[PDB]
Design a protein around this ligand. Structure first.
Ligand SMILES: [Ca+2]
Ligand SMILES: [Ca+2]
Ligand SMILES: [Ca+2]
Ligand SMILES: [Zn+2]
Ligand SMILES: [Zn+2]
Length: 158
């Protein structure tokens, strides 16, 4: 599968979920990028204008790619592996209730998983990995990538 062949990667938040404070959206996505650059050579920067490598989108139902969201529950978000255009982009189902904590769906945790996909990771069979397909709330202040997450991103980069 695809990997980014460049070290400086950019993202853009396209729009903001009304479920949270704006600064909290900025912080959650910031923090999620840092999870991955802590273990690879990549550097991530937020730009506010023009074409980003990774476009962060809150949308609901059918939203202009071929992967319709399905209302509350089920599919929480999805992301496209490295490549041009929509390659790299990470979309969050606005029909979920995005939060900074354990109520609704923790944006930070979901973003870590989705940027994993933006960077070219698939899913892990290990329930303990963040790349396990099913969403588990863990304390975000003491969150750490599992061994398997680290082996996986490391074999793509670095
Ligand atoms: Ca893109
Ligand atoms: Ca959903
Ligand atoms: Ca929402
Ligand atoms: Zn989408
Ligand atoms: Zn996934």
């Amino acid at each position: 599968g695809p990997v980014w062949r460049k070290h400086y990667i950019t993202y853009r938040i396209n729009n903001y979920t009304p479920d949270m404070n704006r600064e909290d959206v900025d912080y959650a996505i910031r923090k999620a990028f840092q999870v991955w650059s802590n273990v690879t050579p990549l550097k991530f920067s937020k730009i506010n204008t023009g074409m980003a490598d990774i476009l962060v989108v809150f949308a609901r139902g059918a939203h202009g790619d071929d992967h319709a969201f399905d209302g509350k529950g089920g599919i929480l978000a999805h992301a496209f592996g490295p490549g041009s255009g929509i390659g790299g982009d990470a979309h969050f189902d606005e029909d979920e209730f995005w939060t900074t904590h354990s109520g609704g769906t923790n944006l930070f945790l979901t973003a870590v998983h989705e940027i994993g996909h933006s960077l070219g990771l698939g899913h892990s069979s290990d329930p303990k990995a963040v790349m396990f397909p099913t969403y588990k709330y863990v304390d975000i202040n003491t969150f750490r990538l599992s061994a398997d997450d680290i082996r996986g991103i490391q074999s793509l980069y670095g």
